[PDB]
Amino acid sequence: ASLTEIEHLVQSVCKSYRETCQLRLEDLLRQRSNIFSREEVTGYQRKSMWEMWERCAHHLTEAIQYVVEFAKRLSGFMELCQNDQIVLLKAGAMEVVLVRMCRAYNADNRTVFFEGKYGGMELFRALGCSELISSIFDFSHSLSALHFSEDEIALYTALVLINAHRPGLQEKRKVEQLQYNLELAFHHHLCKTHRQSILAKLPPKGKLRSLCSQHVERLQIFQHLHPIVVQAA
Ligand SMILES: OC(c1ccc(-c2ccc(CN3CCN(Cc4ccncc4)CC3)cc2)c(F)c1)(C(F)(F)F)C(F)(F)F
């Protein structure tokens, strides 16, 4: 692993992120003042859990599609067998969506960009999932305090996906090598940018993991009775 190779991996991972980040940072920021009105919030709260579930399902399905496209552009991911690609994505795609979410989160007023405007967590009341929604807002509140840059999100979410400890992998050594390469790139870039300090402030991978298991359990109990077909890209 030469300096030139490490830096090419850095630049490469950051390019794939730039091409598959669903929402441009500039828009998210300039729309921070565009907040749902009290009447609009009441409108979301009056919807049935079934309508709200299908709006969130569509929103999450779309975001997962971008995370999948992100993975496919990661050096070496496509050279993995189909089984390992699926294992990695099934275990990590929703964790990455939760990480990316902090870009759309405004720590000042505790609102998130959702269907065109910023709203607090009371927007999702109809789902009857206050505790879980609150946990998701707290998680992205923590990441916002770190001031995650776009390249830190790119490199960190690459490491969420490329994890040689996911059970079910058939080529563990090949994933281990990809993982260590990405760890090198991530650590090298933090040094270049003077951001060593965030390693210890990052959440433990078990925090993100537990958050997504509670997520998917409610996810399946919802889709068990209300399926939907979404678009592509
Ligand atoms: O698990 C449940 C659940 C219900 C709703 C959300 C949910 C949906 C949307 C948002 C706002 N988004 C976050 C993702 N961000 C992606 C992104 C960000 C930045 N750049 C590119 C892409 C766009 C903004 C927040 C939360 C959820 F996460 C889980 C429940 F808890 F209710 F049970 C379910 F499904 F069962 F209903």
Author numbering: 265 to 497
Give excerpts from the publication.
RAR-Related Orphan Receptor C (RORγ, gene name RORC) is an orphan nuclear receptor (NR) that is widely expressed and is involved in regulation of various metabolic processes. RORγ is also a key player in the immune system where the lymphocyte specific isoform RORγt is a so-called ‘master regulator’ of the IL-17 producing T helper (Th17) cell subset. Structural and functional analysis has revealed that the RORγ ligand binding domain (RORγLBD) is comprised of 12 α-helices (H1-H12) and a β-sheet region (BSR) that responds to cholesterol biosynthetic pathway intermediates, hydroxysterols and sterol sulfates. The results presented here indicate that the RORγLBD requires a ligand to stabilize the active conformer and that hyperactivating ligands enhance coactivator affinities by allosterically driving electrostatic intramolecular interactions between H12 and H4.
More recently, RORγ has also been found to be the driver of the androgen receptor in metastatic castration resistant prostate cancer where the selective RORγ antagonist SR2211 elicits a potent cytostatic effect. HDX-MS analysis of the selective RORγ inverse agonist SR2211 revealed a distinctive profile. Specifically, RORγLBD bound to SR2211 exhibited protection to amides surrounding the orthosteric binding site, but SR2211 offered no protection to H12 suggesting that the activation function surface remains disordered. The co-crystal structure solution of the RORγLBD bound to SR2211 reveals a deactivation where the carbinol moiety pushes W317 into an alternative conformation that prevent H11’ and H12 from nucleating. These findings are consistent with previously observed pharmacology and show that HDX-MS measurements can distinguish agonists from inverse agonists.
